[PDB]
């Protein structure tokens, strides 16, 4: 467990991930969800786009400014899904909702942190390989989200930096495997203690 749970949204199903997140924020547990553009939704794209267009038709007739707010960003769509799964008209639910942060792409400071997945909501786990699915990024871009291209450009920049960091880790890890072989005589006895209790194989 961690103080702040940072969840990568890529490859996850919207409702399944929302149910897990909604429970966690109700149990304290500040949650941060990133890459909400990468969230998937079961069913073919056109069905899901129809669902969200049908959501746009729901406006107060007398005064649409007071009516339902249709949020286009993948972050806000996921945020609204979680809100539907919370008692958001009570102080407890509102406090729970404040514990959730949603982001499109991975903004700093969460881009330099380990991101965890929820296998109970992963598309590869929950959907048969032959079922169609929709990307929240493409769906949002076609219902009025303006920053699909900017996010995609910044995500490509972030991925360039993260590979330099990974190459450095592989270099460091190759050296640490070299280090163990050099000093194996000086750490032999300590290795046996780890092997005896299963800490090493």
């Amino acid at each position: 467990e961690v103080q702040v749970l940072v969840l990568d949204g890529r490859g996850h199903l919207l409702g399944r991930l929302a149910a897990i997140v909604a429970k966690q924020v109700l149990l304290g547990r500040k949650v941060v969800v990133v890459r909400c553009e990468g969230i998937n939704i079961s069913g073919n794209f056109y069905r899901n786009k129809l669902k969200y267009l049908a959501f746009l038709r729901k406006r107060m007739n007398t005064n649409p400014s007071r009516g339902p707010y249709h949020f286009r960003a993948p972050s806000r769509i996921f945020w609204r899904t979680v809100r539907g799964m919370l008692p958001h008209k009570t102080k407890r639910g509102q406090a729970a909702l404040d514990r959730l942060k949603v982001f499109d792409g991975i903004p700093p400071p969460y881009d330099k942190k380990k991101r965890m997945v929820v296998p109970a909501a992963l598309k590869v786990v929950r959907l048969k390989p032959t079922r169609k699915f929709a990307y929240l990024g493409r769906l949002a871009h076609e219902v009025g989200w303006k920053y699909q291209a900017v996010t995609a450009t910044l995500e490509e920049k972030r991925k360039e930096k993260a590979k330099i960091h990974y190459r450095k880790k592989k270099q460091l890890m190759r050296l640490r495997k070299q280090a163990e072989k050099n000093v194996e005589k000086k750490i032999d006895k300590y290795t046996e203690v780890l092997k005896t209790h299963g800490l090493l194989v």
Binding site: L5, L7, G11, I20, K114, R115, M116, V117, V118, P119, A120, L122, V124, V125, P129
Partner: protein
Amino acid sequence: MKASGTLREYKVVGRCLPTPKCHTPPLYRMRIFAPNHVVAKSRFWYFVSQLKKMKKSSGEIVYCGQVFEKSPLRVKNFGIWLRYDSRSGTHNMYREYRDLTTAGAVTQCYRDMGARHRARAHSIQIMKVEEIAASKCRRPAVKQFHDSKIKFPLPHRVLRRQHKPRFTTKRPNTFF
């Protein structure tokens, strides 16, 4: 009847109560597949009342004992003849199953009828169950397992322990 759990084959033997007209009524033997012996006896009276003019009030359950599988360790192709009531009319079907036991195949049949035909147990009458040779099998779903050297992998193994751990940094592998 409710096809609760796995079914058991019961050998039920019954007869009419002796009367001055008939001092030794004939004995009737039926194979009954029921969750328990209480249901097995109830199904026996339902069937012999349709076949003979024999009711529970005038009859007697002479014997009711479970029939154990005589080869539980050998896979066998079972043919089942049944009749059931659909939403419109009654139909006779012949179905094939592979199972280690006669009763497990009959239980599979009840699940299959529930799945492919929405057939509740109360609407199904099992007529004949018997082990059939592989050469006499008709359904391709069963016939495909008659290979002396059968070989197949297990593709796209789906993670089942999806909440242990609930949160992890590792995306699950499906190819094992």
